[PDB]
Amino acid sequence: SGYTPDEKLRLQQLRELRRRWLKDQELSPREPVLPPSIFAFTHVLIPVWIIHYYLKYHVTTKPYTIVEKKPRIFPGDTILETGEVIPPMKEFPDQ
Amino acid sequence: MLCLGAMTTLFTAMCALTQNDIKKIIAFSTSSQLGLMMVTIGINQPHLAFLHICTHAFFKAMLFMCSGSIIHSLNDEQDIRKMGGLFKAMPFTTTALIIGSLALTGMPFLTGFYSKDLIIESANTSYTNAWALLMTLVATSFTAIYSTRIIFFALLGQPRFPTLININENNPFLINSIKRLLIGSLFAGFIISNNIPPMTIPQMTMPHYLKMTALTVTIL
Amino acid sequence: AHIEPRYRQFPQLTRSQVIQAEFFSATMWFWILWRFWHDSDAVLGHFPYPDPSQWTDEELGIPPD
Amino acid sequence: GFVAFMLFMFWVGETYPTYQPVGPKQYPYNNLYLERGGDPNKEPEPVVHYEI
Amino acid sequence: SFPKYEPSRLASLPTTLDPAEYDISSETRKAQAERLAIRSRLKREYQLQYNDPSRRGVVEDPALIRWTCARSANVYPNFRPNTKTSLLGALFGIGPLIFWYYVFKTDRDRKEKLIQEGKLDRTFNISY
Amino acid sequence: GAHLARRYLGDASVEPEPLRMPTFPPDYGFPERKEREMVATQQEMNDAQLVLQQRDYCAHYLIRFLKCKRDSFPNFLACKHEQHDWDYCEHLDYVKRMKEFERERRLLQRKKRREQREA
Amino acid sequence: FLPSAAYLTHQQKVLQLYKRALRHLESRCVHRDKYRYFACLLRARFDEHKNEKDMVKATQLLREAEKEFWHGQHPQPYIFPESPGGTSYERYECYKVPEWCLDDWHPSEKAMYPDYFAKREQWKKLRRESWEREVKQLQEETPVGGPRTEALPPARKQGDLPPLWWHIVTRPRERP
Amino acid sequence: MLKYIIPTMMLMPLTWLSKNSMIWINTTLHSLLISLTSLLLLNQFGDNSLNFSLTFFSDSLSTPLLILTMWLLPLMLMASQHHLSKENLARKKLFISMLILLQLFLIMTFTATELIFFYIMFEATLVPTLIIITRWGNQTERLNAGLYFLFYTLAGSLPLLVALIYIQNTMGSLNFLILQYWVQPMPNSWSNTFMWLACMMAFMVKMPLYGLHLWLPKAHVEAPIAGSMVLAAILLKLGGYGMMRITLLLNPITDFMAYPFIMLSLWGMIMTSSICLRQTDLKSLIAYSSVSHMALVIVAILIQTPWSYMGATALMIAHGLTSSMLFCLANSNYERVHSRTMILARGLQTLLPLMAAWWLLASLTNLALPPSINLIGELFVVMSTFSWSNITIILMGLNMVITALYSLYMLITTQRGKHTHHINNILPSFTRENALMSLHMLPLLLLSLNPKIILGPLY
Amino acid sequence: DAPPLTLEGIKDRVLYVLKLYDKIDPEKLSVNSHFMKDLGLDSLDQVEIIMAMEDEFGFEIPDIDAEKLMCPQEIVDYIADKKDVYE
Amino acid sequence: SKMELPDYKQWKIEGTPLETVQEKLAARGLRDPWGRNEAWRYMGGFANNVSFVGALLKGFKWGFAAFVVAVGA
């Protein structure tokens, strides 16, 4: 088949208009728009200070608050706080 | 737990075969990995499932990021048809994909060895459902074969992608991110998976063809 | 200058990206080798899985019949 | 048909399990008593294990 | 080599294999021509109401207003209570309601009988 | 394995049903063979906050492994030989459990076929 | 369901069948060389009975061809990432802000962009000046009471712009 | 409480003898000052209620609803221009004074000591709303809507008066304390059953439940924004307030006789959430949303758990704020395009870039976003009803799924995907509409920080 | 994606991949020539030509247009219309 | 704004899958391919791309030497 020539001529007028519009859509005055360590310091010092102030006084004056699963102690250790030994395990054999 | 995990694992494993988009392959792959983690909760081994979460996370973040690099480099055609020739088209992302789709299966001492193969060992050495074992076994074979097919159609074949090519990786942020996660998925699996307190009893006493069976199934 | 597209040809490659690619694949293979031989050998059982328990009758407790 | 087949084989699995040839896990102190629910002096239950 | 492609209410019959498109009457040609005429006249009126630089508001699509007033206000006329309408009304309106009411009676009678015996797990059941 | 095929294809008796293991009583062919040392000092086993279903035979090696692993931390690969010893002791435990299994199996097969064929 | 005609053609229907079957064979058949072999086989299969002088035999072979095509199609065909159903398919529909807007700005933002708004003012004067007589006379002069087609005539009388051009020229760039 | 009654009176001749183009500023400023002074009320402590007379007294149920009323007045009095800004000065003053008088009877109603006084100020609230929606309904069935509103709410509400007179002359006075401290159980006769059915059915009409809910959507889609928001928020939550107060009497027979209302409320909650999934007429979706959430409120009131009453009052206040705001966004889109439909006004992500945030945030407060008050209310109702029966939580979660579905469909229908490119009249968003949105949302988030206020009597 | 395109590039590339085709010749190949009228190739191969441009530039053109291209000038014009090839 | 557009005729039908398939189809009796639009895919930096085991065994070109050095250390 092919184009009817009416479509060819109408299409050519839209080619001229579309290319002139799209060439106009560039802005170019060559002045397009015009008006009419410290990070690590602040973010590892200021929230650390605020939270560590918050966690001593308010938090540990509320009694049932931050609580830790206790350190496991082993039969060869010695207790750092008072100072006394923990009795070692007995003989090994038949392995 | 483990019936549902085995059902998901076989279903999305068989569904991952004959998929011709990248991201849908990766989604079915991660669904199969979550199926193994539901099997890992079905057997009384939660800590191995958590280890698999960590290693899986490193691994498929690296894999998605590499595929996104390729898709933006190749004008977003995004499909496995019209994808082929990318090896030696700068091979940093091909190195990333072969390290990845190597690490998806059980490769004898890489990051994907520890989690997945301790999962299948503790799954085999337990009072299990006797069909879920076979489902996880067959789906390990299936993740081997779609890993091989994603490698073969993504990197190896004759180059089928249209001309005026601008394949580009001379790029700081891309190579820094892929670099950081390959350094992750090579070492951090072992570094995480070794220095933890043993919260369970490791099995460690298997016969023959029950420890070898992971590598046997991936090779076949 | 940075990269430029080229038409109907194999693209050009800077030596930097290909030497980091070769380096990272080679270190992956180096890691699987030095983690295979030197330290673990976990693909083997590492303990001899025995036979049926001892294959010793009159031991472990059975009476003769 | 496929969903019925998968659930049928799961039922066949649930009636026919696998297990490695292995007895119980032998616990030392009265099937690990006093670290179950409790009763500290009510029921010391006499049960022992023997070396084989 | 064909399974004849049975259709359904969800698998639509595609435009290729009708196969009524391949034995054609002249009246169907007349129908397609007049249907093209209707769509051409509607697009002509729409495009003339569409490109006026003086026009400000919306185009006032009459088919959308017609469908909306057909769907909201013009349901209640027309209506007559038929045997089908009454049957389907008393089925969808009262049936499931009386079903869930029966099952709530059953569950509450079981629960109150069971706590009258007292053998529930209310050893501590505080936040009631 | 092969025990599963024998138990699901052969007879119902001579392969023992698991998780109902003690069928014949102990000291049936033992007499006076028992040590069961359990040198693990249960109070200090409570003191080291172990997980349940680990408070078992071969747990003193777990105590020693935990002690060395805590006491030499920044060596990532410090404790190897004691962890190997703990795996060896659990291997001994698994061997002992398998010995219990096949003891009850051989007793059941030989003695029950003796009894139910000469009864 | 097409703008210019009512029925496609017979030849147009065979031609759409050929393009769809060749595209599905592309999607079915990777490595491109066995594709080229099978595509020339398909081209030969059309050539073997292209020159049949009947018409009911032509529609017979067409109908059985649709049967033996719809038997052998492909489930996820490789459609391009601009086609409907594709990977993108108006990906960048996020940014197609139409140009009936941009006149509702504050005059300080209009003072930031002088030249583009001045040239938009002259295009809008070109729209308003040449709207009424020329476009409406060409649209109410040549058609019958029934238009019976959707192709609209070009402006070839003496001068100015074609009728009904504004929302066809001033469409967004499709890659903004 | 007289210190809140009398400046509401004094704010009325303000509107008359303020001059032209100055009535607006004076009424908005002074009603916001009334809102601060209203927020100064919140004194209520522990053991008793607080008594602002033998005539006025405040339970902690009435405090957040009262602050809600005196906070929703200035928001509305700003919300109701641009559709009557071109009308006459006298009709404008009449409309504003009608809203002030409606506030006055709402304060009368929320601080009602006596149930007789509560009934009189209940239907006194009923009076001006008909005049408002009929005179400014801006559609052709506003007559039908106002008339159904009137005869439904009266003909349900009317034998409640007879039951209250009977309680008045069989047990002495009707202060809530001496109705309390004296209330005796009323056994399973039939006259007690009809008294219960009269009172509870009057408030059933007011909420509404499913068999009586077509009362509502005509009165919202055929009404102005002021009547719509006051109608929905304050009138439905006032009905719930009234049921909460009157259910202290009739203790034993509610277990015998309160099963079918639970049933109709649950199944109609499901059917109403299903009917507001497929409709056009964007205004009506929020109306049937309100029907669904107040059916949930009704289930919560008729089961008699303290968890249920806390969840009930939290759900009341949160849904009042959310549905009033979402009505206001619907009116904003209707002022943009004179449509009222839903499939027409498409696009609006590209255009109007800030309005997407308010649509999304209101749709998530309707979604039961988890730190918000709406999920707090719905969650405690689900806890109490699973304590009621172990099987009814399926309907609650199915309501949850369908509620998220239709709310997020309402989001992604009007404001997602493609402008219809034949609209070309919509202007960028004014400061007024966004000021109204910020007056809606920010109290809800600040109550989401600290919800110890809005939990009611059983805190 | 950062490609530059112009009318020169699309004209030369379309004329290139029409020059490479087998059963026509680069001897008599102007920009302005029909397909059926003077080059003398059949409409089946004309749709193969359209398939080649679709598979090269990476986007479908519909068969409501693919009836009626017939000449490389209108091919260059239509794909330059679809991609909006200006700055 | 040059591209320099590397011209036609600088390939032939010599990409060996295209050559074998034109031989098979010429023995079939058609001789009408699309032909020369794919030789750029079958020559250049392409054309003996590596197979599958080579791509995974690409590691130890640098690897065994460093492994032997680390073992000997």
Side-chain angles (χ1 to χ4, degrees), chain G residues 102-119:
Chain G
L102 174 62
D103 287 332
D104 294 332
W105 281 8
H106 188 274
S108 296
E109 293 179 353
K110 290 184 178 180
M112 292 178 71
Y113 293 152
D115 291 333
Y116 177 69
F117 281 153
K119 295 177 182 180

Side-chain angles (χ1 to χ4, degrees), chain J residues 51-66:
Chain J
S51 178
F52 185 72
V53 296
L56 277 76
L57 294 178
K58 187 257 288 180
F60 55 89
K61 291 184 284 187
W62 193 75
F64 280 164

Side-chain angles (χ1 to χ4, degrees), chain B residues 21-34:
Chain B
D21 303 334
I22 306 171
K23 292 181 181 179
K24 297 173 73 173
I25 286 172
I26 311 302
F28 286 151
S29 180
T30 190
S31 180
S32 178
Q33 299 301 107
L34 269 76

Side-chain angles (χ1 to χ4, degrees), chain F residues 64-82:
Chain F
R64 294 181 68 249
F65 170 68
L66 264 293
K67 184 176 185 292
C68 74
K69 187 177 180 180
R70 194 269 310 276
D71 289 332
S72 65
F73 163 71
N75 276 319
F76 181 77
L77 296 173
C79 296
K80 291 181 181 179
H81 294 287
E82 295 180 354

Side-chain angles (χ1 to χ4, degrees), chain H residues 78-326:
Chain H
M78 182 168 284
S80 65
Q81 60 184 349
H82 187 73
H83 70 88
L84 56 90
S85 67
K86 84 282 289 180
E87 292 178 353
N88 289 321
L89 186 144
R91 296 174 68 246
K92 191 185 289 184
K93 287 182 177 179
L94 185 63
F95 175 73
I96 296 170
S97 65
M98 194 66 72
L99 281 175
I100 302 305
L101 181 140
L102 182 54
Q103 190 205 14
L104 181 61
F105 289 119
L106 283 167
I107 302 156
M108 285 280 107
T109 316
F110 280 111
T111 316
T113 294
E114 300 176 356
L115 301 178
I116 302 298
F117 186 77
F118 183 75
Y119 177 74
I120 294 170
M121 300 301 169
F122 177 82
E123 295 179 355
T125 295
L126 194 162
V127 172
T129 307
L130 182 143
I131 298 170
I132 291 172
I133 68 172
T134 307
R135 190 63 187 271
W136 293 275
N138 207 163
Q139 200 174 358
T140 187
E141 290 183 353
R142 53 185 170 90
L143 294 172
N144 207 166
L147 187 60
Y148 283 174
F149 172 74
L150 182 73
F151 282 168
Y152 279 155
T153 318
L154 266 76
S157 177
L158 182 271
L160 173 62
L161 180 60
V162 177
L164 288 173
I165 302 301
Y166 181 71
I167 297 298
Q168 178 64 260
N169 57 14
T170 197
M171 289 181 184
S173 178
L174 291 180
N175 184 2
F176 187 71
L177 297 171
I178 296 178
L179 179 64
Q180 200 176 5
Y181 296 162
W182 283 4
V183 51
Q184 58 187 357
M186 301 188 77
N188 191 2
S189 67
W190 296 104
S191 177
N192 297 322
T193 305
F194 281 110
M195 187 180 75
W196 181 76
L197 191 142
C199 297
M200 299 296 284
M201 185 64 76
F203 286 152
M204 279 300 117
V205 170
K206 192 60 187 293
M207 299 296 176
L209 81 165
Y210 180 68
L212 292 162
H213 76 282
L214 63 91
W215 172 67
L216 193 59
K218 296 178 181 179
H220 284 172
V221 304
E222 294 165 354
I225 187 64
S228 179
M229 295 187 290
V230 146
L231 178 58
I234 313 298
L235 274 79
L236 302 186
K237 278 71 179 173
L238 187 274
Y241 174 76
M243 180 177 283
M244 275 290 289
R245 285 193 180 276
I246 63 101
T247 187
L248 187 141
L249 51 87
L250 291 169
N251 290 317
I253 47 93
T254 184
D255 295 331
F256 290 159
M257 295 295 107
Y259 290 167
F261 291 159
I262 292 297
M263 285 302 301
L264 186 53
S265 299
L266 286 176
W267 183 254
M269 180 183 69
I270 298 301
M271 294 302 290
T272 306
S273 293
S274 179
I275 195 178
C276 62
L277 201 152
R278 200 177 180 274
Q279 287 184 355
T280 58
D281 287 330
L282 178 61
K283 186 68 72 70
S284 66
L285 298 177
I286 304 103
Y288 288 102
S289 311
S290 179
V291 176
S292 175
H293 289 286
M294 297 308 107
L296 186 59
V297 170
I298 277 302
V299 175
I301 301 302
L302 271 74
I303 62 178
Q304 288 184 355
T305 302
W307 296 95
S308 180
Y309 283 173
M310 291 183 284
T313 182
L315 179 57
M316 285 179 190
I317 299 159
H319 183 77
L321 287 176
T322 300
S323 68
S324 177
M325 180 179 174
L326 200 56

Side-chain angles (χ1 to χ4, degrees), chain B residues 76 78-79 81-82 160, chain G residues 27 31 74 76 78 87 91:
Chain B
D76 296 332
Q78 200 264 333
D79 298 336
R81 280 86 56 89
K82 197 174 182 183
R160 56 184 82 90
Chain G
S27 65
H31 300 173
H74 187 73
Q76 286 84 15
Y78 179 68
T87 300
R91 184 190 184 94

Side-chain angles (χ1 to χ4, degrees), chain H residues 335-404:
Chain H
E335 288 181 354
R336 292 293 183 270
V337 284
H338 297 283
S339 176
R340 191 180 290 113
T341 63
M342 187 177 73
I343 205 66
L344 179 61
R346 296 183 65 197
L348 271 69
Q349 282 301 114
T350 71
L351 308 168
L352 281 74
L354 187 143
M355 203 74 202
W358 297 114
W359 278 99
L360 179 59
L361 195 60
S363 177
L364 297 191
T365 56
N366 201 5
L367 200 80
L369 178 137
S372 177
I373 304 299
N374 194 0
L375 184 135
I376 291 169
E378 293 180 355
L379 184 62
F380 291 127
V381 176
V382 168
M383 297 300 106
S384 176
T385 194
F386 190 77
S387 177
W388 189 67
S389 296
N390 292 110
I391 187 66
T392 186
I393 203 165
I394 296 170
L395 296 177
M396 296 300 179
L398 193 146
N399 189 13
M400 191 70 73
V401 172
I402 292 177
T403 299

Side-chain angles (χ1 to χ4, degrees), chain D residues 22-44:
Chain D
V22 159
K25 292 180 182 178
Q26 296 184 358
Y27 291 93
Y29 286 153
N30 295 317
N31 206 166
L32 195 60
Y33 193 73
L34 298 175
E35 295 177 354
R36 301 293 182 185
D39 294 331
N41 52 3
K42 291 183 179 180
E43 293 179 353

